[PDB]
Amino acid sequence: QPLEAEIKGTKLKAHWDSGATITCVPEAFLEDERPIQTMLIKTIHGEKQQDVYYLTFKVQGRKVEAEVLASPYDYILLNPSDVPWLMKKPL
């Protein structure tokens, strides 16, 4: 059951993953954007750096802004730190 989210006014499906500590979005939303900060990641094949993008999107009808990473996926990934209310039941 994918969640609903709106990025830059664009409506798309999203997935909640507590394992993720940072929101992850598809480059399709960063193609014409710019990363405010970058992160360095070391891998067995070599060292890779991940760019960070601060975007604004609605989470279940809730305007919320957070940094997201660009990914080849076709959806969005929400973290438990950005959507702390999702863990709590709605009133």
Write out the residue range of the structural domain in which residue 2 sits. Answer: 1-91
- Give the chain's end-to-end CA distance (angstroms, integer): 21
Query: Phi-psi bin for 22: left (phi > 0), alpha (psi -120 to 50), beta?
Result: beta
Total domains in the chain come to 1
Q: Which listed residue (17, 32, 74, 82) is catalytic? A: 17
Half-sphere exposure of 55 (CA within 13 A, CB side): 31
Q: SS in 3 state form for 11-75?
A: EEEEEECCCCCCEEEEHHHCCCCCCCEEEEEECCCCEEEEEEEEEEEEECCCEEEEEEEEECCCC
Q: How was this structure determined?
A: NMR
Number of residues assigned to the chain: 91
As a whole number of angstroms, the distance between CA 58 and CA 65 comes to 8
Q: Cβ(41)–Cβ(49) under 8 Å? A: yes
* Amino acid at position 8, single letter: K
Query: Phi-psi bin for 60: left (phi > 0), alpha (psi -120 to 50), beta?
Result: left
CA angle 2, 23, 42 (to 5 degrees): 125
- Decide if 17 is catalytic: yes
As a whole number of angstroms, the distance between CA 32 and CA 40 comes to 22
CATH at 52: 2.40.70.10
CA angle 51, 81, 40 (to 5 degrees): 25
